[PDB]
Amino acid sequence: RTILVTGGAGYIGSHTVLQLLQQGFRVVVVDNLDNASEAALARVAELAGHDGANLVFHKVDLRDRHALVDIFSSHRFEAVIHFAGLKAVGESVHKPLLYYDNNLVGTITLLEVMAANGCKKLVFSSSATVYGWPKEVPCTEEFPLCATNPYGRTKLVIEDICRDVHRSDPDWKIILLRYFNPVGAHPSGYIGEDNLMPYVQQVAVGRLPHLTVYGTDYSTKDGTGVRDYIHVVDLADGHIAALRKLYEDSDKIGCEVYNLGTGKGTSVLEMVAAFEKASGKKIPLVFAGAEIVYAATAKAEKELKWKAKYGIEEMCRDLWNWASKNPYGY
């Protein structure tokens, strides 16, 4: 039983193939590796132990169609999990074509090769920046959508391409997942990343002088911004939950949308406190000049049979655990 995972060498993707491997799956990963290193897949393989053999890695770009058609004709892939993409808001503005070319062309070629190789089961990882900054929280899947930046637009376009493909061929079964701010690392502290918590962690180890808190007078309990965080191990279990919805309850759902997350938001000060407790270090602050945004996960918990298991305190534990062991990444 094989699953193909694009951008599997990345942060969310590497934690994905590990849980996949551990739960009896052959995982084929496709990565350009411009945003990551091979070591992450060598370590996810080690963490998988005897299941390390099941992981197969292809250093190939999703836009390359010939290299991609070869992969899809070498296995019957039960489904495809699409992580490949670029995830930098500031970078997407100065270089919008660089984002539109990578995200849009990469997905289109992917959807084409899949349809041509009889693989029409997809799970796409989408960003919850599509809701924009709304007046009302919690954000439900019925909330209106808007694009704050080219990165957000490129994500919202893919969602529309997925919807259009579904209406063109009812054989397509797509699940679109939206989520907020993955944080943490594998409890072993052997794989991890390389937003706020990264900045907190680099100043907790000494690399940075302090954490600058932007905004101290918001309409929140403490006055600092409230965002939606989610344990990365929890989020990588969310993408798998959808894959089971595709395997068991496929008939019910066609190109459905489930947004993931803990369901509650926490503030910068609430989050710094949760990291000082787990870390034992004390991050200095310097005060400088949306107040709240978070995801309503009621839908996911009901239809997808999924619920986050880890709170903010174990997120910082694991983040500190991996980072303190690996200060220079890989």
Added chain:
Amino acid sequence: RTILVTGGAGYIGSHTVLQLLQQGFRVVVVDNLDNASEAALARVAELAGHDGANLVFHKVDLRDRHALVDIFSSHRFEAVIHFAGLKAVGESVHKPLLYYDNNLVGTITLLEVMAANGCKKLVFSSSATVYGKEVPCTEEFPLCATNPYGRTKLVIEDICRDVHRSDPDWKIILLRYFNPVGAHPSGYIGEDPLMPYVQQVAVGRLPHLTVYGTDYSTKDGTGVRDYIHVVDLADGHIAALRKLYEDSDKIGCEVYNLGTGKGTSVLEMVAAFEKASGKKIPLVFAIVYAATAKAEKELKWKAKYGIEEMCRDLWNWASKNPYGY
């Protein structure tokens, strides 16, 4: 002065490249003849006469990055008019990927080579189908993609707005238009695929026209859409390209409406064609406007032909070429 025109071999593309050659512009046309035929460019060079020797034609696909960078490296360009694209709303639904591939990827590649070889002036052939209310559709009208072909147009219409934010040196004009009708008054070049259908009825290949919607909120009870002479459309882009050159400080990524500012019913157009052609159009029965005030104010452009000249030129090109080229 050299202009690059993509999709210049078909209809609006063929007519515009003709009126660019006629105004002293060395024009390089890029087209992979998917929907058009090469004869349309040969016969455009003829109608240009002496200026016909300024038509450089490269049968290449915009999604072929290496083929495209050769064309930009040799010719030092001044601007690009992007007609290239797939227009069939019908198959855009059943084959959406084919549309996102050809349109989105072909456009993103062109934009990359342009900014690379130092040429950041573009005129885009958008579509007013992005309007998806109030009878006159202004540019500020809320945008609404109704199908995959419409969303490719709206996506490309957002990518340019994003490109301009990243590099202020980019000057772009987005031209939204709908329902081009007619051909060159000579009748030597035109469209070779509602007017095309009523035409085939007059020329005998079709038995009758099918009027879809005999009840509507209109005088005739039939739908009312906007129509613009293809020759009006062609030099409508010329007015845009004229703003990129003469007044390209004020403008950023501007969007303009091209049309006559008036709407025609279905029975009015067929009634018009029955006069201009003399042949009657049997019918078997089964509102969109353009706010041209902006374009005629800041572009110095107003459609010069009317619905009578559209059927005249369309019946002229069609009776002289009943089987295309």
